[PDB]
Amino acid sequence: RGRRRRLVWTPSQSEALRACFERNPYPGIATRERLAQAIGIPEPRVQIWFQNERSRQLRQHRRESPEGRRKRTAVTGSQTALLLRAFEKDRFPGIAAREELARETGLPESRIQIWFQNRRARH
DNA sequence: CCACTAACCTACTCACACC
DNA sequence: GGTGTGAGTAGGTTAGTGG
């Protein structure tokens, strides 16, 4: 289980992220997609940052003191059956395995990761 | 050495289609 | 109401960044 290579923000990207977070710490998919392209970062990395930034901000605010969701990804029985056989072998695929499963299904890798998180909690 | 943090994780919830 | 499952939330853990 290897994780994806950790990126490192440029100052231009950091500024853009904080400015948008300041306006709304709960962006929807459209805001995240626009921001992602505006600063040259894949949208899933942006979503992960907004999650971490909120947990930061809430943790300091604890010791000092709705936009539209992504559209539901349609998953065929063909794709599900292939994800299910992978899931029985390994419930914690690394980035390589997720990228293989994304290639074989045609689904985005970020969606493969969510599918495994949900599947682990319910089976 | 060690503080910070992207990446990843659990747990619970919301959304929404379907019966 | 009940079921199923994709996408949200809070917040904890793992491992790379860089002082």
Swiss-Prot record:
Residues 55-76 are annotated as: Disordered. Residues 2-61, 68-123 bind DNA. It is found in: Nucleus. May be involved in transcriptional regulation. This is Double homeobox protein 4-like protein 4. It comes from Homo sapiens (Human). The gene is DUX4L4. The chain holds residues 18 to 149 of 422 of the full protein.
